[PDB]
Amino acid sequence: GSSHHHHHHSSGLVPRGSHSGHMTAHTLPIPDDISTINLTDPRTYEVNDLSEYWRQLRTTRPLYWHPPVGDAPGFWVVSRYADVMALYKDNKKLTSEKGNVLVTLLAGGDSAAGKMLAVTDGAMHRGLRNVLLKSFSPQALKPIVDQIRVNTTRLVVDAARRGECDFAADVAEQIPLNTISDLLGVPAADREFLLKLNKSALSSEDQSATDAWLARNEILLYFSELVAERRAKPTEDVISVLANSMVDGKPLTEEVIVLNCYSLILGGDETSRLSMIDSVQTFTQYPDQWELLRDGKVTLESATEEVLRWATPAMHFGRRAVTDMELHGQVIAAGDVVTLWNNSANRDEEVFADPYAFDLNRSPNKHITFGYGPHFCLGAYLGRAEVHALLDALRTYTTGFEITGEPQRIHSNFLTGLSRLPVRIQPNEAAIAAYDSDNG
């Protein structure tokens, strides 16, 4: 006996980690019936490959009436890119002011409506976007972007030296939220205070109902204290700009300014994470594309847009109809909730030649992973920068990587992607040495 092996028979597989997975990926059934799929529950995005579902809708039922599920009601499903683009543009005949996602739209409202940017229309929206325009311009964001790049490169290099890591928790969770609170102007000491306070605010399972409300309350109260320091000292950060500006003739109320600050920490976080996690997974699925990125045969800018188009973390956003509309001969009445499906739109063969090919040098690439029109993502440039920085770090300091355990999906009828991605990273060893002589 020189080298030893395990002894098994028809069983004997021990759990390695907290999961009990055996496969890198799973073949999901491709459904054919339209009525067999319920879009309300998250599970139907994890058990199904909706590729054929979405094209059946995109060719025969562009404006499809989804049936009522459990408690009322049914809703309109919009699949085609041109249709989705057109409805995003209309903030007059449609509104976000009664919610912009399935949960809020089907429940019949958003509690922050008329105050929070995403759920506000008319003059109030126009004014809120204008005061924040300069704060989100490339020029003002350049120091932020530069810091994102430093952080991402450090997190990737450490993950590369480590070799064995869970990409979600060790890299992806560690960029977006710290970026946005930096932009908001919270001190570094107060960051961990915000993180643990938000985690329970967004907890579900299982007097825990109000525990989440109090957690949210405390964040809002803390921001209100940072707001108070508007008069004390303006600081160029978003909190300061919002507290010291006025729209249109009147100053913004404590609740509004503070509620939008919180909307920034909600929106600046998960959706970027999901994109970053998705890119890494997709590179292991399409090695030639990864090779193309690593060997510098495609620009980071172009590659970034393809990763965004591929991931499409926010599967849908929705509106409610104020006045009656007529699309494709069919009637959309007042009160009806419409859902615009970005993930189907970024797979439309009408706009994207060979839609299910992951192509880093794809052009044109006019996706709608961010919105379109008035509600077009405020932090699109940030989302881009965070992906851009990851891609740049990856091609500089790694030669390749591989999925190491069964990845874990997030459960949402609205967002998609992974919460856990075990990877083995193969580091560019000589590149790290160059990073170590300069830094440290």
- Give the residue numbers of the binding site: 100, 125, 129, 319, 375, 377
| Among 155, 180, 258, 345, interactor with ligand HEM by CB under 6 A | 180
Residues 216-235 within binding reach of ligand HEM (CB under 6 A): none
Nearest distance from residue 370's CB to ligand HEM, in Å? 5
96 or 428: CB nearest ligand HEM? 96
Alpha carbons 237 and 180: distance in angstroms, whole number:
10
Binding residues for heme b: 100, 125, 129, 319, 375, 377
| Among 242, 294, 313, 336, interactor with ligand HEM by CB under 6 A | 313
Short-list 352, 284, 261, CA closest to 312: 352
Which ranges constitute the DSSP H helices of 79-121? 81-89, 102-107
Q: Binding pattern to ligand HEM, positions 261-300, x when CB under 6 A?
A: --xx--xx--xx--x-------------------------
256 or 377: CB nearest ligand HEM? 377
Q: What is the CA radius of gyration of the chain?
A: 23
State whether the Cα torsion 239-244-250-253 is positive or negative.
positive
Alpha carbons 120 and 100: distance in angstroms, whole number:
10
Alpha carbons 189 and 175: distance in angstroms, whole number:
17
Q: Binding pattern to ligand HEM, positions 364-393, x when CB under 6 A?
A: -----xxx---x-xxx--xx----------
Contact between 117 and 264 under an 8 Å Cβ cutoff? The reply is no
DSSP-derived 3-state class of residue 125: helix
152 or 271: CB nearest ligand HEM? 271
**H or E segment to which residue 167 belongs:** helix 167-170
Q: What is the largest CA-CA distance in the chain?
A: 86
Nearest distance from residue 380's CB to ligand HEM, in Å? 6
**H or E segment to which residue 52 belongs:** helix 51-59
| Among 314, 321, 393, 418, interactor with ligand HEM by CB under 6 A | 314
Nearest distance from residue 154's CB to ligand HEM, in Å? 20
| Among 95, 96, 152, 281, interactor with ligand HEM by CB under 6 A | 96
Q: DSSP E strands: which ranges in 234-352? A: 316-321, 325-327, 330-332, 337-341
Short-list 431, 424, 429, 430, CA closest to 284: 424
Rounded to 10 deg, the angle between the 254-267 and 208-232 helix axes is: 120
272 or 413: CB nearest ligand HEM? 272
For 369, half-sphere exposure in the C-beta direction (CA atoms, 13 angstrom radius) is 26
Number of residues that bind ligand HEM (CB under 6 A): 27
- Does 100 contact ligand HEM by CB under 6 A? yes
Nearest distance from residue 129's CB to ligand HEM, in Å? 5
- Does 104 contact ligand HEM by CB under 6 A? no
39 or 307: CB nearest ligand HEM? 307
116 or 403: CB nearest ligand HEM? 116
Residue number, nearest CB to ligand HEM: 379
Token pair recorded at residue 417? 């992607």
76 or 435: CB nearest ligand HEM? 76
Strand partners, 318: 339
Residues in contact with ligand HEM by the rule CB under 6 A? 88, 96, 100, 117-118, 129, 180, 263-264, 267-268, 271-272, 275, 308, 313-314, 317, 369-371, 375, 377-379, 382-383
